[PDB]
Structures are given as structure tokens and as C-alpha cells.
Amino acid sequence: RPLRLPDGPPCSQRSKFLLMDALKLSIEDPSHEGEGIPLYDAIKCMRTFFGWKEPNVVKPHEKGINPNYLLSWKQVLAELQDIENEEKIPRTKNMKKTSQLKWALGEELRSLASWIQNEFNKACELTDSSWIELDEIGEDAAPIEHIASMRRNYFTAEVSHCRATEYIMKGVYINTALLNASCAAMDDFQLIPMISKCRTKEGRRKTNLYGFIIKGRSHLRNDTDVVNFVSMEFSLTDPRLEPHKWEKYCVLEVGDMLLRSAIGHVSRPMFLYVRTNGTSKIKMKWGMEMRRCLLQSLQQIESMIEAESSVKEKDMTKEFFENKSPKGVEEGSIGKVCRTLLAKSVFNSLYASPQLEGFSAESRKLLLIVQALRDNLEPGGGLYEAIEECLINDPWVLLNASWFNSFLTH
Numbered sequence: 257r258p259l260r261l262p263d264g265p266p267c268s269q270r271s272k273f274l275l276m277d278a279l280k281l282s283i284e285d286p287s288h289e290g291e292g293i294p295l296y297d298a299i300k301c302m303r304t305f306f307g308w309k310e311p312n313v314v315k316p317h318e319k320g321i322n323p324n325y326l327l328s329w330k331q332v333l334a335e336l337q338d339i340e341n342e343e344k345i346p347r348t349k350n351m352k353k354t355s356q357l358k359w360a361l362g363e364e365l366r367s368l369a370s371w372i373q374n375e376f377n378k379a380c381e382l383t384d385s386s387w388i389e390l391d392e393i394g395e396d397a398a399p400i401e402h403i404a405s406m407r408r409n410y411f412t413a414e415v416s417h418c419r420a421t422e423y424i425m426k427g428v429y430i431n432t433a434l435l436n437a438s439c440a441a442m443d444d445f446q447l448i449p450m451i452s453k454c455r456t457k458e459g460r461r462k463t464n465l466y467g468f469i470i471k472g473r474s475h476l477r478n479d480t481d482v483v484n485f486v487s488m489e490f491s492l493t494d495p496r497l498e499p500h501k502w503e504k505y506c507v508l509e510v511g512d513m514l515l516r517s518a519i520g521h522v523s524r525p526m527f528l529y530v531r532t533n534g535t536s537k538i539k540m541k542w543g544m545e546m547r548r549c550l551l552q553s554l555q556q557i558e559s560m561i562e563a564e565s566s567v568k569e570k571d572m573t574k575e576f577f578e579n580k581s582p583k584g585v586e587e588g589s590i591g592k593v594c595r596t597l598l599a600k601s602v603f604n605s606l607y608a609s610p611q612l613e614g615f616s617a618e619s620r621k622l623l624l625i626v627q628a629l630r631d632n633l634e635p636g637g638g639l640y641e642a643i644e645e646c647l648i649n650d651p652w653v654l655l656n657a658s659w660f661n662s663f664l665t666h
């Protein structure tokens with residue numbers, strides 16, 4: 257019996273920021289007066305682009321007030337232009353409490369769509385830049401012993417450029433910024449750049465800007481209290497190709513970008529994905545800890561190394577990572593295994609949910625029960641309701657259920 261996945265319209269994107277669809281404006285080896293202040297970096301990133309144009313709505317939010325999102329992007333550009341004219345460029349920027357920002361800050365079965373599997377595939381790929389330092393992984397108070405060091409270095413080599421790692425660091429930055437603004441600017445509609453930092457294959461430090469968020473009032477007395485925000489994210493993805501994915505968004509067209517491509521220079525429109533969203537103290541605390549995804553992935557790898565190593569009465573770390581009884585690597589290479597474990601862990605973070613919790617526990621139970629049956633038989637009901645009670649509309653849970661059905665047919 258495969259699981260019954262629900263029927264209904266396709267599921268929609270529900271992450272706090274864009275994943276495979278993000279777009280970066282970047283400055284290499286930055287060295288401007290006041291480098292390392294997000295607002296300064298963001299302005300310098302904005303001014304690397306010359307394709308801006310009069311924005312318009314190209315995919316409206318069917319339940320929101322689309323004029324207000326348009327006005328909010330134009331307000332960002334206007335107020336950033338103001339900062340540019342003040343002699344001393346300030347450190348933070350508190351937006352005027354306009355009607356459009358007041359409205360936007362707040363002052364059902366879905367079927368599995370193909371996009372979430374593509375997101376996951378994109379998360380496993382390598383990028384052309386590194387997102388962590390060599391000793392990023394680990395909190396150890398003492399120097400780690402020799403084998404632990406060797407394993408960390410092999411693993412880091414495999415995942416440092418991974419796209420899932422860019423999501424970790426992106427996620428860590430924006431949650432840190434938003435949590436700190438939530439407490440330092442409680443009453444302000446603070447403009448918060450979405451920034452990440454990486455290093456090129458040639459070693460050039462780069463600062464990247466994905467877009468902006470604007471927080472609402474945030475007198476967060478509890479971990480579960482919510483700060484609303486509006487997010488505004490560049491993308492080269494035309495939302496008209498997969499409209500169902502962008503149900504929660506109003507999408508503007510804001511410029512045109514000249515691109516290197518397999519056909520040479522091409523001009524492509526630049527979009528801006530706009531939605532209203534919210535988070536809480538406790539979720540922002542969790543987002544600041546996303547580097548733990550790296551430790552948890554590493555630890556799953558080390559389990560496998562220790563199992564093979566107990567079988568051989570010998571450490572198998574070199575033999576494992578260099579792919580020297582096992583006669584192959586199902587994913588194709590040791591690197592893809594590491595990055596797949598990572599991508600799984602990061603997507604558990606990015607798409608956390610009660611649905612994911614129930615499915616994770618109740619499917620482990622059904623797994624072990626089906627395992628003991630396949631092993632102890634030839635080919636020839638209640639727990640099933642527990643799992644499928646989590647199969648409602650969440651893309652990550654549905655994708656994992658899809659995967660579970662594949663582990664059944666095999």
C-alpha cells in the first residue's frame with residue numbers, strides 16, 4: 257500500500273526567502289567608506305545595476321492589495337535615494353509609516369507539484385563560490401583529535417560551495433538582522449537588507465544583496481510573539497511559467513538585465529517577488545542556528561564511517577571519502593551523498609512544520625515495520641492514518657511522502 261497523497265490545486269512556495277529563484281546583486285572585494293554596514297553595502301549593490309525601470313505588477317497577489325506592494329517598492333527606492341543624499345550615510349533606515357506599509361505589515365488540500373523536487377535538486381548542486389570558512393563546522397572548546405579533524409576537512413571540502421550552504425548563511429544573516437532589529441527598533445518600520453557573503457574560486461571576497469525586508473512593530477514579549485514583515489526579492493524567474501508556486505506573492509517587473517549566456521549577451525527582465533510574512537523570536541533563534549545543519553550532516557556521515565570502520569577493525573575515513581565491500585556510490589559520488597544529507601537537513605529547517613514532525617516520526621515507525629517484513633518474508637492500517645493526517649498541503653512533507661512511496665515500490 258503506497259500512501260494516499262491528497263488531491264487538489266498544486267502546492268505553493270512557503271519559505272521565508274527565495275531559494276532556487278533568488279538573484280544576487282554583488283560587489284567584489286568591497287572597500288568603500290563604511291564597508292560591512294548592511295545599508296552601505298546594499299546601496300553599493302543597488303548601484304551596480306543600471307537596468308532599473310518603472311516597476312509594474314506582472315503577477316498579482318489574488319488576495320492582497322497590489323497597488324500597496326507597488327507603492328512599497330517605489331518607497332524603498334525613494335528612501336534609499338534619500339540616504340544617498342545625506343552627507344553622513346546613516347547606519348539604519350526607518351521607513352516612513354505610509355498607508356501602504358501600514359496595510360502590508362498588518363497595522364485546504366494541496367497536491368504535490370514538481371517545483372519542490374527541483375528546489376531540492378538545486379539545493380544539492382555546487383556553486384562557484386565558498387560560503388563557509390575551513391573551520392566553520394564545530395563548537396569544540398579544545399582542539400579536535402586527529403581523525404575528527406580529517407573527517408571535518410573532507411566534509412567541508414564537499415559542502416563548502418554547496419547551494420544548501422548558501423541558504424544556511426543567507427538564513428543565518430537575515431534572521432540575525434531581523435532578530436536584532438526586533439529588539440533595537442521595536443516601534444520602527446526598519447528597512448533590512450538581505451545580505452550574504454562568499455569567496456570566489458580565485459579568492460575574491462564578495463558581498464551579495466538578494467533584496468530587502470521591512471519589519472513591522474515588534475514588541476516581542478514572548479518566544480511565540482510574531483513580528484510581521486514585507487519581503488522584496490530580486491529574481492530572474494518569470495512567475496507566469498509556474499503561477500501556482502507564487503500564490504502568496506505579488507510579483508513586479510523592475511528592470512532589465514544584460515546576461516552572459518550560452519548564446520552570448522542576452523537581455524532578460526528582472527522581477528521582484530513581494531509578499532507579507534511573519535516570524536517569531538523562537539523561529540528567529542532557530543534561524544540563527546542553521547549552521548548546525550552542517551554539524552548534523554557531518555555527524556550522519558561519521559556514523560557511516562564508524563560502521564564500515566568497526567567492520568574492518570581499522571579507521572576507514574580515507575577509504576570512505578576517497579571512494580577506494582562497497583563497490584560504488586548510489587548517488588554517484590561521496591560528494592553528492594554529503595550534499596544530499598546537507599540539503600535534507602537544511603530543507604527540514606527551511607520548511608519546518610508540525611506536518612513535518614508527524615510525518616517524520618510516524619514514517620520511521622512504518623519504515624522499520626516494512627523493513628522487518630521484507631527481510632523475513634517472500635513477496636507474498638491504523639498507523640497509516642497517523643502519517644496521512646500530516647499529508648495536507650506542505651510541499652516538503654508531500655515531497656518526502658512521494659519519496660517514501662518510492663522506498664516502498666523498491
Ligand SMILES: Brc1ccc(-n2ccnc2)cc1
Nearest residue numbers: 299302303308333334336337
Ligand atoms: Br540606491 C538606489 C538605486 C536605484 C534607485 N532607483 C530609483 C528608481 N529606479 C532605481 C533608487 C535607489
